[PDB]
Design an enzyme around this catalytic site. Structure first.
Site, PDB file in Angstrom:
ATOM      1  N   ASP A 127       0.881  -1.255  -0.159  1.00 38.36           N
ATOM      2  CA  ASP A 127      -0.491   0.271   0.026  1.00 38.36           C
ATOM      3  C   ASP A 127       0.433   1.199   0.029  1.00 38.36           C
ATOM      4  O   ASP A 127       1.905   0.660   0.424  1.00 38.36           O
ATOM      5  CB  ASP A 127      -0.897  -0.032   1.295  1.00 38.36           C
ATOM      6  N   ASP A 179      -0.544   5.235   0.710  1.00 34.50           N
ATOM      7  CA  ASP A 179      -0.978   6.018   2.192  1.00 34.50           C
ATOM      8  C   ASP A 179      -0.932   5.157   2.904  1.00 34.50           C
ATOM      9  O   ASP A 179      -1.503   4.218   3.139  1.00 34.50           O
ATOM     10  CB  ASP A 179      -1.862   6.567   1.549  1.00 34.50           C
ATOM     11  N   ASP A 217      -2.641  -0.437   6.047  1.00 33.02           N
ATOM     12  CA  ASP A 217      -3.148  -0.119   6.995  1.00 33.02           C
ATOM     13  C   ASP A 217      -4.476  -0.018   7.225  1.00 33.02           C
ATOM     14  O   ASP A 217      -5.118   0.767   8.369  1.00 33.02           O
ATOM     15  CB  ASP A 217      -2.523   1.438   7.309  1.00 33.02           C
TER      16      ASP A 217
HETATM   17  O1  LIG Z   1      -6.735   6.349   4.876  1.00 28.94           O
HETATM   18  C1  LIG Z   1      -7.056   6.798   4.566  1.00 28.94           C
HETATM   19  N1  LIG Z   1      -7.593   7.906   5.346  1.00 28.94           N
HETATM   20  C2  LIG Z   1      -9.006   9.184   4.917  1.00 28.94           C
HETATM   21  O2  LIG Z   1      -8.754   9.555   5.770  1.00 28.94           O
HETATM   22  N2  LIG Z   1      -8.771   9.034   3.797  1.00 28.94           N
HETATM   23  C3  LIG Z   1      -9.813  10.353   3.246  1.00 28.94           C
HETATM   24  C4  LIG Z   1      -8.917  10.809   1.631  1.00 28.94           C
HETATM   25  C5  LIG Z   1     -10.741  10.318   0.882  1.00 28.94           C
HETATM   26  O3  LIG Z   1     -10.376   9.221   0.000  1.00 28.94           O
HETATM   27  C6  LIG Z   1     -11.681   8.528  -0.329  1.00 28.94           C
HETATM   28  C7  LIG Z   1     -11.547   7.644  -0.417  1.00 28.94           C
HETATM   29  C8  LIG Z   1     -12.333   5.766  -0.436  1.00 28.94           C
HETATM   30  C9  LIG Z   1     -11.754   4.686  -0.733  1.00 28.94           C
HETATM   31  C10 LIG Z   1     -10.455   4.887  -0.785  1.00 28.94           C
HETATM   32  C11 LIG Z   1      -9.325   5.735  -1.717  1.00 28.94           C
HETATM   33  C12 LIG Z   1     -10.032   7.170  -1.269  1.00 28.94           C
HETATM   34  P1  LIG Z   1     -12.335   9.469  -1.723  1.00 28.94           P
HETATM   35  O4  LIG Z   1     -11.804   8.915  -3.043  1.00 28.94           O
HETATM   36  O5  LIG Z   1     -12.703  10.638  -1.088  1.00 28.94           O
HETATM   37  O6  LIG Z   1     -13.414   8.218  -1.748  1.00 28.94           O
HETATM   38  O7  LIG Z   1     -12.269   8.334   1.255  1.00 28.94           O
HETATM   39  C13 LIG Z   1     -12.765   9.480   1.894  1.00 28.94           C
HETATM   40  C14 LIG Z   1     -11.121  10.281   2.479  1.00 28.94           C
HETATM   41  O8  LIG Z   1     -10.722   9.862   3.121  1.00 28.94           O
HETATM   42  C15 LIG Z   1      -8.457   7.943   2.419  1.00 28.94           C
HETATM   43  C16 LIG Z   1      -7.266   7.167   3.461  1.00 28.94           C
HETATM   44  C17 LIG Z   1      -7.456   6.014   1.998  1.00 28.94           C
HETATM   45  S1  LIG Z   1      -5.622   6.435   1.592  1.00 28.94           S
HETATM   46  C18 LIG Z   1      -5.785   4.632   0.017  1.00 28.94           C
HETATM   47  P2  LIG Z   1      -5.126   3.482   0.670  1.00 28.94           P
HETATM   48  O9  LIG Z   1      -4.128   3.720   1.583  1.00 28.94           O
HETATM   49  O10 LIG Z   1      -6.748   2.366   1.076  1.00 28.94           O
HETATM   50  O11 LIG Z   1      -4.500   2.430  -0.887  1.00 28.94           O
HETATM   51 MG   LIG Z   2      -3.261   2.595   2.997  1.00 35.16          MG
END
Ligand SMILES: O=c1[nH]c(=O)n([C@H]2C[C@H]3O[C@](c4ccccc4)(P(=O)(O)O)OC[C@H]3O2)cc1CSCP(=O)(O)O
Ligand SMILES: [Mg+2]
Ligand SMILES: O=c1[nH]c(=O)n([C@H]2C[C@H]3O[C@](c4ccccc4)(P(=O)(O)O)OC[C@H]3O2)cc1CSCP(=O)(O)O
Ligand SMILES: [Mg+2]
Lengths: 198, 198
Positions: free
Chosen positions: B12, B14, B147
């Site tokens: 992963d 992030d 994570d």
């Molecule tokens: O750990 C996180 N913490 C966090 O707060 N966020 C935020 C950003 C934005 O991402 C999404 C998100 C949802 C699913 C996957 C990736 C991002 P959005 O694209 O806006 O739907 O979710 C809401 C928001 O939440 C997103 C993540 C996922 S980072 C991707 P991975 O490490 O899972 O590949």
């Molecule tokens: Mg992650």
């Protein structure tokens, strides 16, 4: 539509949904009007720049400059029937569709423009269905619909059956049985999917 | 290094390679200096905006504006040890490493910046190893180091074992045996990989 396990179909973007070959030729002729070019009917081999390179010295580099340019991917036109077919396919019961596409190495525009293109033609909710990868063998599915004859990578035994989508560059190729083709989106894609269902 | 079949590891981005939580907090405090915030030690739940939303009305929207901004993803710092570990891991015999990352829905900057970040820290040749997907269950591998506690999607039985990478938001979570953790990149990741090898 999601299921259990739904039948899973990977659909390639360039050469299947988006007209890379036609877009390339149009932009190449417009930018380089005094150079020779390859009519679509005369395309041979997957790699456009290799055929251009044999046509005249320096043309490989000129061809490359077309796909590295801003708006190249975004302004590709959909293939006839592609949008309609994939929207219908995604709506079918027990059927999950992913757009599985390899971006070019020059990343400034291409990944962004592919998301923007999907939003444009399929809408915001289809963005959840995009998989960008240079290795399609590590993506598991029942089917992969893709115009590239040789699809290889880290997984020596992919789970999908590769259905060869016809393009001018591959149209004369004899395939090893039991490999098969989708000749265009007007062709019977539902019969191919149904053949993989329980 | 490629194989036969090499052991395949999905890593992963992030929260594992790139410090999303720390980058978020720094930029949030700088942009919104008069708002309350959540210290990293006090983070609970995967979704940053949900915890911020409970802190004060309107803060969810302010939190969102941080990750939608230009340069948010690109300027994330690597986690300690992450670059060194993944470079070593990729160099191991019979071991193929992919960076498997879900981009946010707002696509203007995020996909581009993730390619640019990988080029920056891992070099051009590592770009071939990037998989962008909102569904990691359709990516086949032996291991997924991530994570997020709950990793779900179209495939009800993923091929990978999910190893939970520790973050402040997940550090107190009891996992169902035989689920396990990688506590940081200083932790013994080679023992986890070796446990999956023939
Ligand atoms: O750990 C996180 N913490 C966090 O707060 N966020 C935020 C950003 C934005 O991402 C999404 C998100 C949802 C699913 C996957 C990736 C991002 P959005 O694209 O806006 O739907 O979710 C809401 C928001 O939440 C997103 C993540 C996922 S980072 C991707 P991975 O490490 O899972 O590949
Ligand atoms: Mg992650
Ligand atoms: O059908 C094609 N015809 C074609 O001439 N090109 C050019 C562009 C540029 O793409 C790559 C390319 C190689 C593998 C995957 C994707 C692109 P580059 O990124 O520059 O290495 O190959 C050389 C160039 O060749 C690329 C393709 C592949 S489009 C992706 P998919 O449909 O396989 O997902
Ligand atoms: Mg193609």
């Amino acid at each position: 539509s999601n299921a259990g396990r739904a039948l899973r179909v990977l659909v390639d973007m360039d050469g299947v949904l988006a007209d890379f070959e036609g877009g390339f030729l149009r932009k190449f002729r417009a930018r380089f009007p005094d150079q020779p070019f390859i009519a679509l009917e005369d395309r041979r081999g997957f790699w456009v720049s290799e055929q251009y390179g044999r046509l005249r010295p320096g043309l490989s580099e000129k061809a490359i400059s077309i796909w590295e340019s801003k708006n190249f991917f975004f302004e590709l036109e959909p293939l006839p029937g592609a949008v309609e077919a994939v929207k219908e396919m995604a709506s079918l019961q027990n059927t999950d569709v992913f757009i599985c596409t390899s971006p070019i190495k020059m990343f400034k525009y291409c990944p962004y423009e592919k998301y923007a293109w999907v939003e444009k033609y399929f809408g915001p909710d289809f963005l959840e269905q995009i998989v960008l990868t240079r290795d399609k063998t590590v993506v598991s599915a029942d089917l992969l619909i893709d115009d590239r004859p040789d699809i290889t990578g880290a997984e020596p035994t992919p789970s999908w059956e590769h259905v060869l989508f016809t393009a001018c560059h591959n149209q004369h190729l004899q395939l090893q049985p039991p490999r098969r083709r989708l000749h265009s989106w007007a062709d019977d894609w539902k019969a191919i999917l149904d053949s993989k269902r329980p």
